[PDB]
Amino acid sequence: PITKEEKQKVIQEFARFPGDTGSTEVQVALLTLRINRLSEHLKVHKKDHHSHRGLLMMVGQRRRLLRYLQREDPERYRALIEKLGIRG
Amino acid sequence: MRRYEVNIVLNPNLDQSQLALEKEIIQRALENYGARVEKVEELGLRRLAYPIAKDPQGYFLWYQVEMPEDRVNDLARELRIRDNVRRVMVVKSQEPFLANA
């Protein structure tokens, strides 16, 4: 799983201001968490395809989110992908 | 690390030497895998509804217990290395859904 605290830590390390749960940045972050967990489970459980569709969706939701950010504030985009290491 | 329930059914033909020898080895595994221990229960000698390992009765240990979850399969694998251990059944502890009221 992803225990409530682990999640909570990430919302914290990413929220634009205190009380920020659902901004582009927190959202991208959380997906990235889910993805890396889900990807570790996939390098082992290669034949679990139903789960793998979940991935494709998360990877999309992410690119679609990031696409928006790069179009509004190309700045905190560059910062966010650096703080995570992605896309480029 | 979550809460569980380890049931063991044992050989119903033991004197206190054999009996508590097994009961100790158990406490070792339990301990040697991360288990702390809330309640114990020992109804012991009960008649099974069909004979397990040739034998119309069984000795019942039940433990509620908390432990590292990624080891609970390992624990139980070791619990039945023994021969006087006949059934080992481990189960996620649970809210007790009731009925009639």
Binding site: - | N7, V9, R46, L48, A49, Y50, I52, G58, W62, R87, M89, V91, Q94, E95, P96, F97, L98, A99, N100, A101
Partner: protein, 70 residues
């Protein structure tokens, strides 16, 4: 006649040990009784089938019996 829930008082039907209760939800062939006879809800009836099956593995309830007088 009676539904097996109409009989009892309150009980934990997540409790795979209480054979004194759980034993009443079986036929004389020790088969899990249908809803129409258990008087239970779809949801309860689901939970029970589970508890009954767990009992069977511990040795406390039967998988089968034989019909007496046919």
């Amino acid at each position: 006649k009676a539904k097996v829930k109409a009989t009892l008082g309150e009980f934990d039907l997540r409790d795979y040990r209480n054979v004194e209760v759980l034993k009443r939800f079986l036929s004389e062939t020790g088969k899990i009784l249908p809803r129409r006879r258990t008087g239970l809800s779809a949801k309860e009836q689901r939970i029970l089938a589970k508890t009954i099956k767990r009992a069977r593995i511990l040795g406390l309830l039967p998988f089968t019996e034989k019909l007496v007088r046919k």
